[PDB]
Assembly symmetry: D2
Homo-oligomer: 479 residues x 4
């Protein structure tokens, strides 16, 4: 029978006993010890919430969406097997996040190990494998009608994508099932629905998307010889607003300039510790923070705990890492200098990121200042903000239906909706920080930065006239 758990977002939810078995494992329970927002807790003190609760939510929403489709449309032949696979993928979709979540795959692994291209989602597929293999889960699957050769593959495909029609877990008459946990067509998935609601509750910013409404109006229809989830035509405004909410959440919380600096400092600490910490994996082999991702027995033990392991240590070889964490505790963070954006449809390419602190340091502002600054002293953090498909409008990849022909899919273009929608769907934000924290250096960094913005024809920083009054005169265009 069912086990019931109380979640403040979703209320009392039922967990099928196979889900309980997956949950009550070291590999699942690890997620109690990884904060959803990483460094964002150090800005938003409500945001103590871990990946654990998020994962329970995704699993429950994934089952709500799949059940609702099955009730309304028996003709789809959604089996109890399908329902369970969707639920497990939801539950397990984030098992590969590392310490401070997106800090780990967004900043640490890319700087510490350029020789791999890794993502938490790959992590999740590997960790799922290890969880199943090391806890006897395969006979428990079989016991509920699942067929592991086929279903393990199905689950992994839902989490990460593929490993004509590119999937080995289900056929085209069940493609809709791939659109629930992680929707590669348009991004509209239950994962966003849970984190929207959960992050807002903890952050103290209020959610304006209604996922329940969306589920009541969803429906599977034929689109290009494949059965897909479509929304009612009238929900198009709400789907625009869903993506607008996502961007607003990034702007107010997830990319808060100080949350990002803290994530950068923790990443720096971890870089300075990577040579000297040892995590014991399979066969007693020793891994590093950056290689624990290659062995799931070691990765199991790599959580936000590592922050405190570094902070509390006495080993002299961790002094450098330790002193950075101490600077976070005392709130001697690197200083935010400002934000700018490129113009003229120009994009800053990933190759160039490492060059930008030099360019800032080589600016020649007319005003003379008490201290000169080297490239070492500047951080330039480039952030790619979008509607989750680079430059594309994701509502172009949604199918809709009308009350009068419920089985007939249609498209709806931007022009059919509103002229007050965004004109573009991707941009870049450049933040600049200084590691020298005294007033004299900060005043200098402000001059270098504003000169650099003038030199590159970037947008006038918002406080430009105030922080660099001698410099915003240079550009006639900034009257």
């Amino acid at each position: 029978t069912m086990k019931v758990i109380n979640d403040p977002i979703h209320g009392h939810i039922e967990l099928h006993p196979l889900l309980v078995r997956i949950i009550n494992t070291p590999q699942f329970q690890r997620l109690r010890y990884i904060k959803q927002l990483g460094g964002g807790y150090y800005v938003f003190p409500g945001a103590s919430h871990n990946r654990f609760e998020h994962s329970l939510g995704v699993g429950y929403l994934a089952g709500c969406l799949v059940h609702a489709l099955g009730e309304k449309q028996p003709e789809l032949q959604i089996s109890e097997r399908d329902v369970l696979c969707v639920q497990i993928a939801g539950l397990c979709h984030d098992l590969g996040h590392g310490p401070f979540s997106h800090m780990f795959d967004g900043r640490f692994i890319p700087l510490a190990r350029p020789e791999v291209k890794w993502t938490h989602e790959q992590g999740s597929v590997m960790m799922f494998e290890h969880l199943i293999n090391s806890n006897g889960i395969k006979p428990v699957m079989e016991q509920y009608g699942l067929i592991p050769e086929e279903d393990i593959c199905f689950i992994k495909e839902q989490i990460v994508g593929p490993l004509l029609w590119p999937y080995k877990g289900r056929p085209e008459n069940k493609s809709f099932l791939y659109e629930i946990v992680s929707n590669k067509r348009n991004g509209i998935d239950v994962d966003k629905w849970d984190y929207f609601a959960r992050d807002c509750h903890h952050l103290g910013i209020q959610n304006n998307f209604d996922y329940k409404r969306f589920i009541k109006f969803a429906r599977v229809c034929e689109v290009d010889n494949e059965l897909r989830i479509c929304a009612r035509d009238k929900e198009v405004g709400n789907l625009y607003d869903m993506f607008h909410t996502r961007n607003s959440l990034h702007r107010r919380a997830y990319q808060h300039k100080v949350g990002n600096i803290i994530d950068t400092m923790i990443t720096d600490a971890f870089l300075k510790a990577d040579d000297y910490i040892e995590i014991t994996g399979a066969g007693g082999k020793k891994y590093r923070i950056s290689t624990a991702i290659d062995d799931m027995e070691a990765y199991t033990k790599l959580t936000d705990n590592i922050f405190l392991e570094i902070l509390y240590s006495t080993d002299p070889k961790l002094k450098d890492a330790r002193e950075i964490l101490k600077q976070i505790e005392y709130r001697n963070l690197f200083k935010y200098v400002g934000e700018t954006q490129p113009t003229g449809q120009i994009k800053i390419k990933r190759e160039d990121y490492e060059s930008l602190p030099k360019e800032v340091a080589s600016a020649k502002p007319k005003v003379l200042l008490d201290v000169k600054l080297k490239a070492e002293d500047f951080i330039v953090d480039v952030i790619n903000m979008d509607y989750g498909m680079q430059e594309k409008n994701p509502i172009d990849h949604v199918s809709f239906y009308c009350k009068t022909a419920p089985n007939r899919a249609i498209r709806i273009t931007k022009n059919q909706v509103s002229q007050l929608l965004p004109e573009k769907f991707a941009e870049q934000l450049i933040r600049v920080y200084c590691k020298k924290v005294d007033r004299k250096s900060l005043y200098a960094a402000r001059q270098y930065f504003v000169q650099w913005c003038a030199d590159r024809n970037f947008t006038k920083p918002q406080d430009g006239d105030v922080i660099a009054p001698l410099i915003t005169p240079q550009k006639k265009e900034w009257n």
Copy 2:
């Protein structure tokens, strides 16, 4: 001493005894009998809230904002007198709404009496006058340090605007006070703050704007020889999102196509009753629903009650009005045919509105029709959606300040914020309805409508290929 009232949105609020005296009058209490959202209750069953509670909220917020400015900046010389006048203006700002709120000044008065320019806000100024004059309020003002020659004028000016520097109630060193209740500079006022939160709570759509945050970061600064309310620079995103919220509330709730059709039907009922209902005003004179606005003693008794007076009557001369309200009760509404918008910087002028049903009826669809339809059978509802200043971006009329120069006001342009903001700030939506409700007539109305949209080079209705498959191929612009 203070009287405390419990409001579900704002919690326990303190009401100065002068405010109590204004509240406990028939002219104030009338607002318990006018629904905030008018016809919206007939679509959103939680929207039973009236103007009364909204008015208490505006009053309270207006005092919170004025106190917060006073606490932080004693140099502004905000007196207890000023605070109270701001509170009274907030409290009394909506005393001129009529039955079903915006239905009355947006639809009924314009059709019934085209020869007047009238708004609820002018109503409020006149009703405030009648309230003061008929309840002995002027001596109670004097009792608390107010000066009615000056302060009555101040209050009225805050509600309606003016009646060099155009105000007779306060000087330029107190201009900021005009920006609280009704902000003619940029629309950022406590009226929106209350209704956002109150409407959301009742509608069952969740608010994402945080008014308290904005008040913590507000500040008065000198801008162009006038003292004005300015926001912190970092709030600029939140202000863009405030206007986006307002627009989303209009699209989801306030302009819901069925909410609007109900308001239209009620307006029609009222038009057919206007000759035959008699409301007793000053000196026993008899007024009509359309002229009760010229006598505040009569207007006092004109509330949503009139709907029920019509619906419950037996007078044979109200049969026509009555039968329309019966059609609302049985849910035999006029039928929604669809929505379209103009293109290419075409704008539909107010003069033209009355012509549009004819143009729809004169569409000549190629496909034969079994029965014709006349202009009488069509409703065409034009809605001007904007960011509250016609085609202007209201954030261009906001002043900001920076952490490093808190007394120095600055401007922030669109391009300094984001490329994902709206490209325009006004549009028009055209909705078309049919009063003949059977399948045969609805099919026909769909053909006329879609043909008309093709004829005017308007946008393709979302369901066009479904409702008029013979017509959407004609038009090259839609493929």
Copy 3:
């Protein structure tokens, strides 16, 4: 197919087309015009909510509870027919409330017509009959598998109770179905669940009962040869807290001394109008406010609108009624003198209520005062507060089950739960008010009242020493 409606409490809910048909009738829609809390809106300005939305909620919760039982226990043979009947009874359970809800059957009908014993629930059964008969609903029932001889009876029985085993609508193997809408065994029904949540949302007092949790743990078991709803043993604390919440809601809101006085004043107004208002019922026959309950065509048109009909009238015969409503608008209410309770396990019997204002007026307080007072000047409002079964503990009438024997019903006594629970389950509150509102009379009424409390050996009013300092010395027991 289903129609979806958005309710701020229950979110998006589905309405079966038979429910839509019942809803879209004059008899149902009338409930938009009757406030749930009656006079409580005049104290709690959020409490603008009508019976309409409450009724939709009860109907939806009734279906949630019946579906959940059917999913979990197929062996019960809960049919789609049963589900619909339960839903209709929920929907229609409050169709008999009159103006200001419980004011009408609690105060007005008892004073205006002692020759009937009437309740809103009888009203609901009669109004249900009229709605069905006058809107062609019987063939629409048949069309969905319902059998009206049997099912109409079932519905009515759920609302009002019966008209061995006392029911003609369903047998003992379906008794559980009578426990959903109005639970005569123990009061634990979906009606309380909706109003708890809905009243709290509008009042601005927060709900602490979780109905969803309760539904997840409910289960039908055999009890005394009848199938009944039982709760899990662990929910016993939550059922005590449910009734505690109900009592707290009565104390803070529903029996707020000023809400009750307003209800009393409106009742008085209606008493003074009952001879002079005419409501047209079936066959053109004229009914009164007090007799409209005998004809459902007339009752259909009797709503809170009557308040405004009286307030706005000019007929000289309604002057007396009108002037009372005017005193509410200006907030010249009768004055609250205080509260007391009986002691010594004594109960005040209903016979005696009319005698109590005399007894107060005949008190002989030692202090001499400027004005003497007659019985006419006092209101004594006796309120019977309980756990909804007079003196009984309703948790004694609940059956529970244990995780180890889910099909075996058990009892749980107070002593098995806690010693911090109430010792008794019913009491009486006596409120005394004065209709003379000047300071001199109020001071007098305070002396009479406190003397009366001393004379009857009632509890010392809370402010006794302050309002009647000369009198609380009389009783040594009040040191």
Copy 4:
């Protein structure tokens, strides 16, 4: 100037720069790593909140309450100095909590070091001292008008109580200030207000106490030659409900039987690790988990992290500790056998707690047993549930005031409020668990347990007839 922080419970709060300096210390920041509800997160997945955020809330509420008193009563002479000290005490009141909060002072320290009387509050006083002394805070206090000889003492006294009139930090004309952070008179303090709201928000149980209402109605009056905080007379019901809420929160959440068993298992782990984990304190001295409380430099590094340190270790001497934490991860918890209470004014004394597992193991059930169980196999957890003052009614220690004599304090007794209030204000709950988890041993533990309850004349467990049908007939008192 002020720093603003966004808290999901209290919204945007202002922190004086002195508060910022206290906050940004390792001794304050440590609280980010101690869960408010300890083992409760392992039952309620929303309860990931730490002491840090609670501390910010207490600090903020403490200032709201002190400011509100100051605004309304200037005559009290509340200085900015006083306000800040109250804020600091609120902020710092919980700095002495250890790992898993109340698990540490409620269970671990009492078992590990029986020879000390220690509480988190004494911890807080010592940790506050270490924070001040090791971060140069005394000069920053002087900089803002505080006087450390006096004010440090004041702060400590607010947290812990005293160290005629027993306080050295403020005189009798400021006694009210001791009633804000930790109220030794009656327990009505801002600490409860914050945790009620914060725990509810995270637990997913809804709060029904309104702290803001209480603050609007609070007032200082003279009572017995001491100035104290008094409430309006009409709040007496709400104060009874406040304590009832606290008890309901304990019954539903804080004392959930599985929450308590997890805390017990963690405590057991810690007991088995105490000899082998070494924490570096002042002058390089090594401390244990149990002695880190004697050195604030060591205690600084003792947080929930220790759980993970044990679970991730390889030291063979932590195997025993480690295997217990493994049993938590796999959800092989000790098994709950049942709950009982004493009767007849029997009380279980703290001396006796350790004896109770033996008494259970020595029960001689008549029914044969296939296997015996030893004392070692049983846990008996005694919980003292009360209204925060052992057997006293805390409303007997509240002072009230009336509208007509706002400076005159009065008392209100139970019988003047209601007959539905608790008869007692303290009880004990006895929970019994078994460490042998198989069916055979659980069956046996159920017999021992129910026999023991029969032997001690304790209450019949709720499931008694089900778990021990051979035993509950024996006892005449249970039929």
